RNA sequence: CCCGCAGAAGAAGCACCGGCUAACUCCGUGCCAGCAGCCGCGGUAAUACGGAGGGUGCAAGCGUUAAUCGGAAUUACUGGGC
RNA sequence: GGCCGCAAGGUUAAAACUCAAAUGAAUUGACGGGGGCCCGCACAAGCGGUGGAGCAUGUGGUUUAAUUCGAUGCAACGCGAAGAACCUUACCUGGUCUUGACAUCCACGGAAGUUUUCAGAGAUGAGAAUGUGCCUUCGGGAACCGUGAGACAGGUGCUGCAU
RNA sequence: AGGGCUACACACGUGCUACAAUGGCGCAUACAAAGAGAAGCGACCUCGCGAGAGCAAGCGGACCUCAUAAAGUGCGUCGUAGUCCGGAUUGGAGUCUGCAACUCGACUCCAUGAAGUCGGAAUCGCUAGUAAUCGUGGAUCAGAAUGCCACGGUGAAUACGU
RNA sequence: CUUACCACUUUGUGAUUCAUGACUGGGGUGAAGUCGUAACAAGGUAACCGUAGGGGAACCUGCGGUUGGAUCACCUCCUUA
RNA sequence: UAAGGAGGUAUUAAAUGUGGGAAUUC
RNA sequence: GCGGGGUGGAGCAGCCUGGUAGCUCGUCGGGCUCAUAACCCGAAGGUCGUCGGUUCAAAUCCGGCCCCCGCAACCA
RNA sequence: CCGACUUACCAACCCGAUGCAAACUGCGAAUACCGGAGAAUGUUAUCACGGGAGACACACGGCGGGUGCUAACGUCCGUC
RNA sequence: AGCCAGGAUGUUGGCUUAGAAGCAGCCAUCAUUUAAAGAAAGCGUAAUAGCUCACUGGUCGAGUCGGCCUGCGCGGAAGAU
RNA sequence: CCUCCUAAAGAGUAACGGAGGAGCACGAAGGUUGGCUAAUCCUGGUCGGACAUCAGGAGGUUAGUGCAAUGGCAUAAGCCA
RNA sequence: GCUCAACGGAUAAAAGGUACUCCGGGGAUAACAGGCUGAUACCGCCCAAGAGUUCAUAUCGACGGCGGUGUUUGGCACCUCGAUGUCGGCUCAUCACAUCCUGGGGCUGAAGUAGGUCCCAAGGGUAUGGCUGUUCGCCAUUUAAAGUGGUACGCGAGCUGG
């Protein structure tokens, strides 16, 4: 399925609000990379964190071998930076997950072959 | 199939990282391939081609 | 048990070194790999992980685990409290 | 489980598992939509503004080959910058060099220079005239230009959470 | 060397200029302080509508130059209108600096003549020579201030009280 | 040979203990989720205890009890020395 | 000046803040 | 078979009686705050299920088609 | 602001050719119907007025049709 | 009709294919040797191969071929005393 | 109740056959006299556009009829006075 | 002066239940069975795109077409309403063949074993239980096989009565 278009799902993780901000950063990064590759992106769904960032986002990527180019980014991305959401400015670690799956073709509806059915009347 | 994929998805937490972005040390390292860069700003701006090409070449 | 023969010739390892607890540095590593009796150690300048040099303690043994008592006055008779 | 109760429940009374604490009093602070007393354009009493408009200027964001980098509650945002056409400039595109634009040392040459020519966007490359001096045991040497090495130079590269 | 740092659907901060009559315009005419100056300040005179140009004094300055302060005052006009308010934008023609003003300088002349008629929620500064308003100079600097630093002119209101 | 006693063995019905069971109750734990903010200050309606009712949840309300609750300043008037 | 008694004072509103913190010690 | 419905992102109005789309939340911009919520000041967003007809003109009236609801579906 | 090219392509009107129609007709029968004339034939077979009714569940066959499945010994019309 | 000869060459036409030789296709589909021999009509081979065959010659010596209109028949054609 | 078809070229003709309308309107929308001729498209033209009003051309009732359908309507039954 | 619109208008004035029921009638008219039909149902055949590595026809067979049976659900309302008792079971059957087993054959993508598919063949044979009133069906375990149907969905003047 490397040639097919793909869907990218980003979900915040252990960092909490910092994780949601990191998820927003990852979303911006992947959108910029798609622009650089010339692929077309749209936002199917999004859930924004209340304080900052996004809790989750689903993006559709369309292009030549989009799934092939993006499939290796699936996993959890670890971020280490002085959390802007800590009063003491401590160095916290946040986690965000990117999952890439191909755009499945719509199934052809198959009518029930009448030779596959047994009908009983009683 | 979807539920098997959800159970296969590693939890978003400690120890499940495959790409570490440490901004204080100004280092980004991919755990799978070992590719490491210091231009964190470029990578955040979208210079993912190095990591993606490395992963594809590794296969 | 004794006498004679030959040549240093045949004979040293194990644990530990952050505190408790005797014994410290370099390199690797980078909340990973790992350690851990307790407190804890590791997130890129680690005497705590792993290797090395040095050192400390024991020794044909040295460590780990299991077990009992001690320390535990932590069932207090000796010998406690409300 | 037992006993008691009409019931609600009472009474008696564990274990597994888990943690390295839980706790009492007092001490120094900090905090209180606790108290008291003071003060400050803090209110109050006023005057003039900002938020609307056009323009300037910084920022963010976006864009871009690059839009260099930093500042980014009060205490960043006409801030570093008391002044980006070139230079600046640290950025980008292209063209170029590799002991080197900037130093010291060694060797080797050539005074320093000055004037030109050509080619190139320029860096630069090639050539042609012209001076060949100053200290000076005719040993010279060194002001200065090159060439050849290698110790080195060089970096406004990262870490202001090592200073 | 050329380009970018000057981009531009947009959001914010800090500024300048206004929305007029306590004003605009025209003529005339008073009163400052502080400071800069030698690859500099540059008088005068002549030319140009003008920015400026040519020639050329003086001054390392209480001496010469920058360099008439402006608000003000007197007279006249405008008579309330998007105006004789506003001066953005744009076209044409120029000047100067600088090798070089296309990207991307400032200034001048002619034309043009936008929004804006006192600004929602909200928010700022100031207690006296202060606020407000009016000019002037300096550094940085070849050229390039509404920014900064400084200097004077006029010159208030209010503070019951906590 | 017979009787008595008696082992194996058989039947019925209980007790106890171990394992197991669809489902169900609560408990402990967690480097982030969702809904609130119940306590700690007078924690913004003092808190807590017994009991009862109600409510997504911390909880609320009634009745009685405890202090293991904070504050207690200031103005005016009158009287006495 | 001291003591006692009485009356008035008073904010309606105000939820929340994840996860990486001691060199200064013979 | 007989009735209803289908309208900004969500839930409801507007239909009857043709001329015109409203409310609440939500979204976006600016405030307040150290910050978020709450709160305050502003904006935007539906050509009305889908076709067709009728009309000068249709969210509205009529007819199909699709989806959703109700009822009914009996004696047998 | 203009606009330039090209077409997997789709095509109104118009022109040429080919069909279709219960609710189409620039055409159009056979029959049937109305009226007039004439002969022959018919026990007036015709009409009017009066007395007495019955009947108003039809069936099949033919032809022309609606409906149904160009089903029914189906159903509903027209006509013998 | 049989029957006897034959039934060649470039050349396996190339591509795509896994292989593709007439015979998976795609894809061209020609000229040469001439009596004639298809870049193949069928069978066949994993592919070839092989087997035919179309075409053509030679012996035997009168019909032979396959459409059109039409009459009568045949199959299709299974049920319960 | 009205219009068309079924309905077989006179009238009439059924079905829970196929399609639609009516339960009004108008003192002018009636009477008469005089006059007039449509839809639609094309070209040109201020705002003005696919579509307003104006001018010309093509066309010839494809319009119109107060309201369904049918039959009519130019001598108009249509439009104006 | 009437939506007397059930529009030749019963009255000025009117809804339902009856499985507690009753009378007069109707096979003029439904429920069962028969009849006509055959849409549907079941069983065949025609064409051959394709599936089957190649290869339409070993086995299947799309888009379409033509039949047979009566055999389901129906249509009609011809018989019976002065009465033709009904699902399943039980007992007892009888016939058809569109054959489930045993018999005979053709082709096979038939090595053998074991199958597939079609043709001939009706002599004989062709389960017991769990659940349910069940038919049907699922399940357990057998068998060479546990056939498909007609017979008023055979059979209550033979039984049962869930
Ligand atoms: K290292
Ligand atoms: K004791
Ligand atoms: K009770
Ligand atoms: K401003
Ligand atoms: K410092
Ligand atoms: K400014
Ligand atoms: K410029
Ligand atoms: K003007
Ligand atoms: K303002
Ligand atoms: K200057
Ligand atoms: K409480
Ligand atoms: K309390
Ligand atoms: K609830
Ligand atoms: K009579
Ligand atoms: K008839
Ligand atoms: K007729
Ligand atoms: K008239
Ligand atoms: K009636
Ligand atoms: K009744
Ligand atoms: K009853
Ligand atoms: K049939
Ligand atoms: K039949
Ligand atoms: K009967
Ligand atoms: K057989
Ligand atoms: K066989
Ligand atoms: K048989
Ligand atoms: K059943
Ligand atoms: K039978
Ligand atoms: K019967
Ligand atoms: K009988
Ligand atoms: Mg020690
Ligand atoms: Mg160890
Ligand atoms: Mg460290
Ligand atoms: Mg180290
Ligand atoms: Mg070690
Ligand atoms: Mg032990
Ligand atoms: Mg003891
Ligand atoms: Mg004790
Ligand atoms: Mg108990
Ligand atoms: Mg005030
Ligand atoms: Mg503004
Ligand atoms: Mg910047
Ligand atoms: Mg830096
Ligand atoms: Mg400033
Ligand atoms: Mg530059
Ligand atoms: Mg370059
Ligand atoms: Mg610091
Ligand atoms: Mg440059
Ligand atoms: Mg800048
Ligand atoms: Mg100056
Ligand atoms: Mg005015
Ligand atoms: Mg003006
Ligand atoms: Mg205006
Ligand atoms: Mg002050
Ligand atoms: Mg000023
Ligand atoms: Mg509380
Ligand atoms: Mg409380
Ligand atoms: Mg209550
Ligand atoms: Mg008491
Ligand atoms: Mg206690
Ligand atoms: Mg919350
Ligand atoms: Mg906290
Ligand atoms: Mg409308
Ligand atoms: Mg009658
Ligand atoms: Mg009758
Ligand atoms: Mg009749
Ligand atoms: Mg018939
Ligand atoms: Mg009949
Ligand atoms: Mg026949
Ligand atoms: Mg007629
Ligand atoms: Mg007729
Ligand atoms: Mg009749
Ligand atoms: Mg009749
Ligand atoms: Mg008239
Ligand atoms: Mg007339
Ligand atoms: Mg009637
Ligand atoms: Mg009776
Ligand atoms: Mg009958
Ligand atoms: Mg019947
Ligand atoms: Mg029947
Ligand atoms: Mg009948
Ligand atoms: Mg009968
Ligand atoms: Mg009888
Ligand atoms: Mg047979
Ligand atoms: Mg027989
Ligand atoms: Mg026999
Ligand atoms: Mg059974
Ligand atoms: Mg049973
Ligand atoms: Mg039957
Ligand atoms: Mg039977
Ligand atoms: Mg029966
Ligand atoms: Mg009988
Ligand atoms: Mg019964």
Question: Helix and strand string of chain A, N-terminal first?
Answer: EHEEHEE
* Largest contact between chains: A-B, 33 and 28 residues
State the strand order across the main sheet of chain A.
Answer: 2-3-1-5-4
Number of strands of chain A: 5
What's the gyration radius of chain A in Å?
Answer: 21 Å
Distance between the termini of chain A: 50 Å
Into which percent range does the helicity of residues of chain A fall?
Answer: 10-25%
**Sheet having the most strands of chain A:** 5 strands, antiparallel
Number of helices, counting only DSSP H or I runs of 4 residues or more of chain A? 2
Q: Helices and strands of chain A: which structural class? A: alpha+beta
Assembly type of the chains comes to part of a larger assembly
PDB class: ribosome
Keywords: release factor, translation termination, charge-flip mutation, near-cognate codon recognition, ribosome
Entry title: E167K RF2 on E. coli 70S release complex with UGG (Structure I)
Chains A, B: Peptide chain release factor RF2
